[PDB]
Amino acid sequence: MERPISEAYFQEAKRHIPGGVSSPVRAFKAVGGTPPFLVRGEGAYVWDADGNRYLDYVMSWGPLILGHAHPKVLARVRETLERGLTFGAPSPLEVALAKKVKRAYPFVDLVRFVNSGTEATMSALRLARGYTGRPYIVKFRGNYHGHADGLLVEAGSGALTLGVPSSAGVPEEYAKLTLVLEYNDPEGLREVLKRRGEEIAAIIFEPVVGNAGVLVPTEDFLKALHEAKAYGVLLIADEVMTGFRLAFGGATELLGLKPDLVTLGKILGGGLPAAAYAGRREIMEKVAPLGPVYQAGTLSGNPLAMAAGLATLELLEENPGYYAYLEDLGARLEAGLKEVLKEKGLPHTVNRVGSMITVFFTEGPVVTFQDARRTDTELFKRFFHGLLDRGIYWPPSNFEAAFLSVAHREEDVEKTLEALRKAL
Amino acid sequence: MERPISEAYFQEAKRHIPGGVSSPVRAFKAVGGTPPFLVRGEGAYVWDADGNRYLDYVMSWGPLILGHAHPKVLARVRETLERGLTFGAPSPLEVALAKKVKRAYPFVDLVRFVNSGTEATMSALRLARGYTGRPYIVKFRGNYHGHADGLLVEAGSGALTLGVPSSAGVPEEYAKLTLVLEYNDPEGLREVLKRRGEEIAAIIFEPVVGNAGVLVPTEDFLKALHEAKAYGVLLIADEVMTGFRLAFGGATELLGLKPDLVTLGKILGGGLPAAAYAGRREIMEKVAPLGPVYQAGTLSGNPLAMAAGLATLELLEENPGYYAYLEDLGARLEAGLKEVLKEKGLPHTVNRVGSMITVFFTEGPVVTFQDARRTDTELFKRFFHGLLDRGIYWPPSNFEAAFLSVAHREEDVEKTLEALRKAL
Ligand SMILES: Cc1ncc(COP(=O)(O)O)c(CN)c1O
Ligand SMILES: Cc1ncc(COP(=O)(O)O)c(CN)c1O
Ligand code: NA
Ligand code: NA
Ligand code: NA
Ligand code: NA
C-alpha cells in the first residue's frame, strides 16, 4: 500500500512536534514504519491522507463504540456549537450528562467532570487521600490511569512495594507513596493489606485491563480487591475504557463491582475530550466548593463534549441490544483468530471481554502483566503490518486492546480473518 | 433581574454534581447568590436560561478574544466535525497548529499538544526536571498553573521556602519539592538562587498574573527571573492566559521575555479544550517518543479543537490591529473605572495589561499577592452584584482578571461605567 502523502506529513510533523505526534504510541515505534495520517472516518472505516481505506480496530482508542461520525451524535454537536463553543459557567447540558452517568452507575450520587482521564484519576486519588487522611495508594503493574507523576512508576527489584520512577523528571519523593502490586495476584494484595491496609487511602485498577493488552480479573482477585474495603481503603474502579462499553454500567455492572469511586471518560464524551470521577455523596462532598479537596478545570464540561456524550449515552441506554451484538461479533472474531493462528502454528493467547480484544503471541494463559510481557513483539510486528498493508488498522502495539464498534459487521470480521490467512 | 429557571437548574445540579458545578469559582461562593446558567453567546454578549442578556467580561475565562461564536471559527469547526470527532492518530491539523504556534513563538522548535493547562504545566515541570536532573521547582504566590498535586501548595509560616499543602489529599511528600516565593520580589528570588539555584530545575510563572487578579511584573523582577538562567534553571513562562492575548506572541513578545519553555492554552483552542508546552529542540527532545520524559494524551490534538484554534490564530495573525484596538478599549475602561470609583470615594486600584483587567478595592499599588489580599471582598460583592443586576457579567471573584474581546465596543464600556454610577 502506498502512502507518500502521509510520509511527507510525518517528516514535516517531526520538525514541529516531538516525534511528530501528540501521544507516543501514535509514532509507530513499537511496530516500525510511518503512521498513516487519518483525515476521515465513517462507521467502522477510516481514510488516510492518501485516500487509503481501512477497517478500523483502533476506533480512537475507545470512545467510538457507536462507530465514526454517528449521524445522531454529530447532529447534537452541530446544534450545540451554534450557540457558542464555551461559557465557563454552569450549563443545562452538564446536569443532563451527570444524570445519565447516575443512571448507568446507581451507587453514584455526585459526578465531577474534567477534561481527561489523567485529570480524573489524579483527582480521584487526591479525593481518596483527603477522605481517608491516608498517604498511600496502590496501583497494579500493566495498568495505566494517566500520567500524573505519582503514577509514572514501576515495581522496584527489592522487597519494598514502593514504586520507583519509570519516567525521567519524576522525583523519588513523588513515587514513594505509590505501592506497585501485580495484577491478578490476590495473595500479594491480601498480604499488603495485612502489612499496612490501614494506611492505604485507595486501590485504583482497570476492571478489565486494556493498557497492557486485555487482562481479565479472576474471581479471587476481585474478591481480594473488595476485601480491602474492610480496612477502610477506598476502591477506585478506573472505567475510562470499560465504562459504557462492557455494558451500559461498564465493568461495574458486568462484574457486579462495588467501588467507592469510579473514573470515566472516552465514550463519556462521545468522541470529544471529557472525563469524570464520581461516587457517593459522603466522599464526593469533600471536593471543592463543598470540601477541602481542591480540583478545578476552567474549560471542563465543554458544551460540545457534553452534547456528544449525552447523545451517545442516550443511544446506548435506548439500545441494550447493542451490547449483545458486540458480544456475538466479538465471540466470532476471537474464535476466528484462534482458528487462523492455530492453522499457522503460531503461539498465541487471545483475551477478550465484550468488544475489547488482544492477541498475545505467547502460549497461554495471560493473566498477569508478567505473562503479558512474554508476548513476541517481533511476531506482533508481522501481524500488525500484514493487516495494515491489507487495509486493516489494528492498534500499533501488542500492549493494547483492539475495539469493536456497533458499526462493525460480520463481513468485516471475515475480511480480517482472510487478510490474516494471506498475510501470515 | 429575575432568573427562576437558573435557580431551578442550580438546585437540580447540586443533586448530581458537587456544588452544582464543574469548577469551584462557578458556584458564586465568593460573591453569593445563584450563578446564571448560560446557554448562548454572540460577540460580547451572553444569555442565560431565563433569556436575560449580559455584556460578558468573563468570556469563558480567556479563550474568546474574538468574542462568542465568531462566524469564521464556527465555520472551520463545522467543516471538521463532519469528517469525524476523533481519530487517535496523526492529523494534518496538528501540524498546522504547531506551525502557527512557532510563528507566534520564534524561540520554539517543538510543540506538544495536551488537553488542558493543568496537563501542560505538569508536563513542562516534569520535562524541566528531566532535562536538568534537578528536583526543585519554584512557583510564586497568587500564581495558578493547574491542580497538579505538587502545585497545590501555599507558603509555610517558617523560614523554609518549601510549600505546604493548600488542599486536603496532598501529602507533604508531594509538596516538599516546590519552593514558594512572592511574586514581584526580586530580592527574595536572587537570595534563593544564591542559596540553591543549582538544584532548582525550573521557575514557572504567569508573565502577567491573572489568577490573583492582574499583577504586572516589575522590570527588576523580570530581570531576576532571567538571571536564574545563569544558574542552569529553566524559565517556564505560563502563557495559558496571556498567550496570543497581550500580543500575537503573548507576554513573551510584549515584554521581550526569553523563556526556555512556554505553556499555552485557552485562545490556542479557540474556545475548545486544548493546551500545549513548547520550547527549543534540545529540551523538547527529552519528551517521549524522542526521550525518557513520559507524557501521553489519548485524545490530545482533537480535530475540532485544532480547527477552532487554527482559525482563531489565523485571524489574530492576519489582524495585528486587533491588539491595538483592545489596548485602546482597555485604556478607556481603566480610565473610566478610576473616574467612577474616585467619584464614589471608594478605595481602589485598577491593574490592566492590554485586555486583562482587575479592580482591587484597596489603596494602591497592588504589586504582590500580599497586596492583592488586602482587597475588600465585601465591596467587591457590591460591585459584582450591582453589575450583574444591570446586565453586566463580571468574573465572580476579586482574584480574577476580566477580559475584553475584539467584539466589545466603546458603547459597551460606556454602558458599564453608567451601570456602576447607578449601582454604587
Ligand atoms: C483506563 C485509563 N485511564 C486513564 C487513561 C488516560 O486518559 P487520558 O489520556 O485522556 O488522560 C487511559 C488512556 N490510556 C486509560 O485507558
Ligand atoms: C495561567 C494558567 N495556567 C493553567 C491554568 C489551568 O488551565 P486548565 O484548568 O484548563 O487545566 C489556568 C486556568 N486558571 C491558568 O490561568
Ligand atoms: Na520492590
Ligand atoms: Na499499553
Ligand atoms: Na516558609
Ligand atoms: Na483566582
Residue A179 C-alpha to ligand 3 middle, in angstroms? 9
Q: Is the CB of B288 under 6 A from ligand 1?
A: no
Query: Cα torsion for B80, B83, B89, B90, to the nearest 10°?
Result: -50
Q: In what order do the strands lie in the sheet with B261-264?
A: B110-114, B275-279, B261-264, B234-238, B200-205, B136-140, B178-181
Burial readout B170-209 (b: 16 or more C-beta within 10 A, e: otherwise)? bbebbbbbbbbbbbbbbebbbebbeeebeebbbbbbbbbb
Nearest CA to CA, how far is B360 from chain A (Å)?
22
Q: For residue B35, is the peptide bond before it cis, meaning its omega torsion is within 30 degrees of 0?
A: no
State phi, psi for A261 to the nearest 5 degrees.
Answer: -145, 150
> Which residues are B393's β-sheet partners?
B56
CA A210 to ligand 1: nearest atom: 16
Q: Which of B280, B285, B299 to mutate to test the interface with A (most CBs of A within 10 A)?
A: B299
Cα angle: B342, vertex B344, B350; to 5 degrees: 40
AA identity, residue B55: L
Residue B164 C-alpha to ligand 5 middle, in angstroms? 8
Q: Which residues of B touch A135 (CB under 8 A)?
A: 171, 173
Cα–Cα dist B315/B73, whole Å: 9
Neighbouring residues of the ion ligand 3, judged by CB less than 5 Å: A 156, 158, 160
Kindly report the length of chain B. Answer: 424
CA closest to A135 among chain B residues: B171
Q: Is the CB of A388 under 6 A from ligand 1?
A: no
Closest by Cα among B345, B333, B269 to B303:
B269
| Residue B105 annotated among the catalytic residues of the structure | no
**Contact: A13, B169; criterion CB under 8 Å:** no
Cα–Cα dist B251/B244, whole Å: 8
Q: Which domains are present in chain A?
A: 1-70+320-424 (3.90.1150.10), 71-319 (3.40.640.10)
Residue A141 C-alpha to ligand 3 middle, in angstroms? 12
**Contact: B9, A94; criterion CB under 8 Å:** no
Q: Is the CB of A416 under 6 A from ligand 1?
A: no
A vs B, Cβ pairs < 8 A, gives 389
Neighbouring residues of the ion ligand 4, judged by CB less than 5 Å: A 211, 399
| Residue B344 annotated among the catalytic residues of the structure | no
Burial category of B105 from C-beta neighbours within 10 Å (exposed 0-12, middle 13-18, buried 19 and up): buried
Closest Cβ opposite residue B85 in set A115, A271, A300:
A271
Residue B120 C-alpha to ligand 1 middle, in angstroms? 16
Nearest CA to CA, how far is B319 from chain A (Å)?
22
**Other beta carbons within 10 Å of B348:** 22
State phi, psi for B99 to the nearest 5 degrees.
Answer: -65, -40
CA B211 to ligand 2: nearest atom: 16
Resolution limit in angstroms?
Answer: 1.9
Nearest CA to CA, how far is A290 from chain B (Å)?
6
Closest Cβ opposite residue A24 in set B131, B176, B288:
B288
**Contact: A148, B152; criterion CB under 8 Å:** no
Burial category of A157 from C-beta neighbours within 10 Å (exposed 0-12, middle 13-18, buried 19 and up): exposed
Q: How far is CA B216 from CA B151, B221, B350, in A?
A: 21, 10, 11
Q: Which residues of A touch B94 (CB under 8 A)?
A: 13, 17, 22
3-state SS, one letter per residue, for chain B: CCCHHHHHHHHHHHHHCHHHCCCHHHHCCCCCCCCCCEEEEEECEEEECCCCEEEECCHHHCCCCCCECCHHHHHHHHHHHCCCCCCCCCCHHHHHHHHHHHHHCCCCCEEEEECCHHHHHHHHHHHHHHHHCCCEEEEECCCCCCCCHHHCEEECCCCCCEEEECCCCCCHHHHCCEEEECCCCHHHHHHHHHHHHHHEEEEEECCCECECECECCCHHHHHHHHHHHHHCCEEEEECCCCCCCCCCCHHHHHHCCCCCEEEECHHHHECECCEEEEECHHHHCCECCCCCECCCCCCCCCHHHHHHHHHHHHHHHHCCHHHHHHHHHHHHHHHHHHHHHHHCCCCCEEEEECCEEEEECCCCCCCCHHHHCCCCHHHHHHHHHHHHCCCEECCCCCCCCEECCCCCCHHHHHHHHHHHHHHC
Q: Active-site positions of A?
A: 144, 238, 266
Query: Cα torsion for A358, A364, A369, A373, to the nearest 10°?
Result: -80
CA A119 to ligand 2: nearest atom: 11
CA atoms within 13 A on the CB side of A109: 12
Q: Which residues of A touch B308 (CB under 8 A)?
A: 85
> Which residues are A205's β-sheet partners?
A237
End-to-end CA distance of chain B: 17
AA identity, residue A239: E
Nearest CA to ligand 1 atom 9: B297
Nearest CA to CA, how far is A374 from chain B (Å)?
23
Q: What method was applied to determine this entry?
A: X-ray
Residue A360 C-alpha to ligand 3 middle, in angstroms? 26
Report the pocket of ligand 2 as residue ranges, CB < 6 Å: A 296-299; B 116-118, 121, 144-146, 206, 210-211, 238, 240-241, 265
Cα–Cα dist B299/B277, whole Å: 16
Residue A417 C-alpha to ligand 3 middle, in angstroms? 42
Nearest CA to CA, how far is A25 from chain B (Å)?
8
Q: Which residues of A touch B88 (CB under 8 A)?
A: 23, 26, 58-61
Q: Which of B12, B78, B87 to mutate to test the interface with A (most CBs of A within 10 A)?
A: B87
Q: DSSP 3-state assignment of A244?
A: coil
DSSP alpha helix (H) spans, A107-240: 117-132, 172-175, 186-196, 219-227
Residues A351 and A215: beta-carbon distance below 8 Å: yes
Q: How far is CA B317 from CA A105, B92, B103, B273, in A?
A: 47, 20, 9, 21
Q: Tell me the best of A241, A267, A302, A397 to mutate to test the pocket of ligand 1, counting ligand atoms within 8 Å of each CB and taking the most.
A: A241
Nearest CA to ligand 2 atom 3: B145
Q: Which residues of A touch B118 (CB under 8 A)?
A: 115, 119, 297
